[PDB]
Write a protein that binds this ligand. Sequence first.
Ligand SMILES: CCCn1c(C(=O)c2cc(C)cc(C#N)c2)c(C(C)C)c(=O)[nH]c1=O
Lengths: 553, 403
Amino acid sequence: PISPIETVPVKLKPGMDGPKVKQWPLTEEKIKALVEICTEMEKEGKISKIGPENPYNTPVFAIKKKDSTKWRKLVDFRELNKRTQDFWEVQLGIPHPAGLKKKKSVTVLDVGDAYFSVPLDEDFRKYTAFTIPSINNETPGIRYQYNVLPQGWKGSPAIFQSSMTKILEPFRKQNPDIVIYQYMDDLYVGSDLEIGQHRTKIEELRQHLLRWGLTTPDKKHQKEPPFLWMGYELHPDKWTVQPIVLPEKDSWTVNDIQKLVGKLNWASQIYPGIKVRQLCKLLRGTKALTEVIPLTEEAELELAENREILKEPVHGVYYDPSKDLIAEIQKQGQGQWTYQIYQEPFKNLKTGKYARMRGAHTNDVKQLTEAVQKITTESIVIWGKTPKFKLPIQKETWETWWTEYWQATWIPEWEFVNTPPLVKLWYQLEKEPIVGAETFYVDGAANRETKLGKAGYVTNRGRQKVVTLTDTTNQKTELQAIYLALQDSGLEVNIVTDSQYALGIIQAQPDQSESELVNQIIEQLIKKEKVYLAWVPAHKGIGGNEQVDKLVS
Amino acid sequence: IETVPVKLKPGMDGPKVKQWPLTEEKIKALVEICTEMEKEGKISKIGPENPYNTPVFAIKKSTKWRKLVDFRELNKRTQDFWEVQLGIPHPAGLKKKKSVTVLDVGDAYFSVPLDEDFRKYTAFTIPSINNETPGIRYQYNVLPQGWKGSPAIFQSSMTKILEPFRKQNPDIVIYQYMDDLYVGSDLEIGQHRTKIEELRQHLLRWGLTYELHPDKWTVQPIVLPEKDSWTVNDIQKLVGKLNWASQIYPGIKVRQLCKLLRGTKALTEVIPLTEEAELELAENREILKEPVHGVYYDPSKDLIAEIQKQGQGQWTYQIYQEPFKNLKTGKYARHTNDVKQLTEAVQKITTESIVIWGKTPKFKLPIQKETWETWWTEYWQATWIPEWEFVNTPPLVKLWYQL
Ligand SMILES: CCCn1c(C(=O)c2cc(C)cc(C#N)c2)c(C(C)C)c(=O)[nH]c1=O
């Protein structure tokens, strides 16, 4: 049918007029095909013969489906698209399974000829005018316009979705104890009634759609669980991803490895502890898709763990609105984090995996704070509330970080759980100068053209030293001078610099870096006992600043 | 009543800002509220043919969920209108007044119809959890709170409404900024409060049902330590600080003090003071106390605000248009929630900013974008929303404004 529902007013973009593409002349079998379709369509009410005045045209085409002997009508709305208004998003975000409440009763309902069952803005049909050429293109062709929503037009998915929503509305108000999920042109219906009173309202629902143009599958034509969907496999009281098979190959091409990383990432939302770092290092470079990549030791070790975790099947449970959500996070490796959400231990609603790094230098406390946030937003999206957290970090560790760090920060309600590795601060810089500790005044520099570089220091006990660096930047040297002061000093040292740069880096208490130097500066800072870092203005003639400043050039 | 025709800025299109995820409690709240004002006909459901969108969410101002709309995008896309075509002039007298009370008059806009052909630009979406259903979409039919056009379009009515009260108290300053009325007088506080109540009654006959003290506003001057003993370390700090200050204040001198730091001394060593140095030190304090010479407000230019976390629930901030030309600086103090406090400071600073310049500043916030974006809505209880970007505080900036 063609639903009675009001139409949605459509416009074209404001400075624009509708399409006028020329019809490409079509062979004879294609002309015959299009006639056979379009007459059957105007019988159904879907289109209508017009006669020019109508100046508009979108080209037509017929294709063979595609070993069978059936044909199909393709329209190239390419241009009417371009000239049509933007619509609202048909749907932004799709439901995550782990967000679903368990249901007593489930039925899937499937709209038929959905787009063609919905009227097109009468004022707009004129722009849909298309034209079937005559044989060897000699006479005036047959010219139709759409009455319903054309397959492949810009406005159709939005307008259909909208129409299915106004039509479901009165029934939703009346049947609030029942959930309908609209995805594309399907419907999913669940309630906590018994199969009887369920199919009672199911039919009662179909007979509501039917008053409105919408024809559906009856009792005899409804699929049963699992309802594979969108990558998931959905059962009556639990869910999992669709079955994942890791290929078995001797050679791996870049394309074999990208597909694997994906299938793993997908598994990662219900299979705890999946890793992909070692496999991802592999993709770096400028290779083609056909290039075979020899797996590293650590990648194979890693494909191994993954190969095992996936061996036995795992499932996720459904959401019980009357319990708290509990999120558990573990440091799983070098900047890699894994988490689990559950309400009753340890039956997970879902699992997940955090791997980003923020900046060139972070420490675990920072990285852990970023995961909490990431996990928090996610929870808002899937369940509408934030979880109780359980983190591998003492309250005192966190409390010492928050307080002394300059950024504002905050995680919601959490608890320490002893799941090593624990996260700790790896060194504290002193808040005051050390006494009887050798004060190094360090400095570094570089010729912007030569790219030559000197880094050195002068101390108050008369020591000096200045090494040379080849092709280094004015700021690389400044870290070097500090690495320097740290190599050549005892377990306690004051260090003075003019680099706000170096300052900033070190005062952040990094514990990993995208820098070799900074990684070494770090391991030193670890080995020390007290270290006090201090900044001074360059070129003001301050302290021993001027001295070492001369040693370098 | 006849609707003022509203145009966007030339060429540019309306807001397409997507809706942030909301908590079930805020969603329910919004559903009620909106079901209500649709009955009353303030908003109507809209279809997919409206491409536009701006975020909404719920706050608590009192324990009655209010509905807030982020019209920042719309505001920028309309700002020929609320600035140059109409325009509510700022009184320089407001900051001078002994007491200023801020009144919410946004309920006033809900009476005036909105230009038919502008309404599509006010579309918002109440989202759904786990994307279970499509959001519920609405546009406005009346002037919306939060939009800079509503006070601009309602100016003629506000003047009429306020006209008698102004005539009867010609020495009282009343400013309108967005959803708020600002009322300043020099009266003793009881008389002042009494005068506000008279005002409410006038307001009350048209459907319009806290106290600043702007005088008590002064610089958070750059603070130079006074010390029993100075170590080299303490001198170097002192030089750093003055070396900063000299980019802002003219006259700043350092020389007599750097003299002290010749050679390579241990940091923890005590250097006694020069008669010159101590003379310098004082005249610097003279300068630091005073407002920057040569720094002036340019109404054609954006206000910027920067905030440093000082620890101990202390927060320093400066406002300026060209970096280091500070129009003013201050501190804000005293839950040990970092984000709660920051949110409070942003509102306070924005408030002062409106009173002095009729402008909100763009804020540079010392916090991870994502952290701030998750949480700020839990503590925001103001009716406008300023612009913000996110910034790592340079370790030196923070200390130079230390207290
Ligand atoms: C049957 C258990 C899953 N389930 C569903 C549901 O069946 C469903 C859900 C989604 C998002 C997609 C698909 C598909 N394909 C099916 C529902 C429906 C009625 C929303 C439910 O409420 N609870 C539930 O456990």
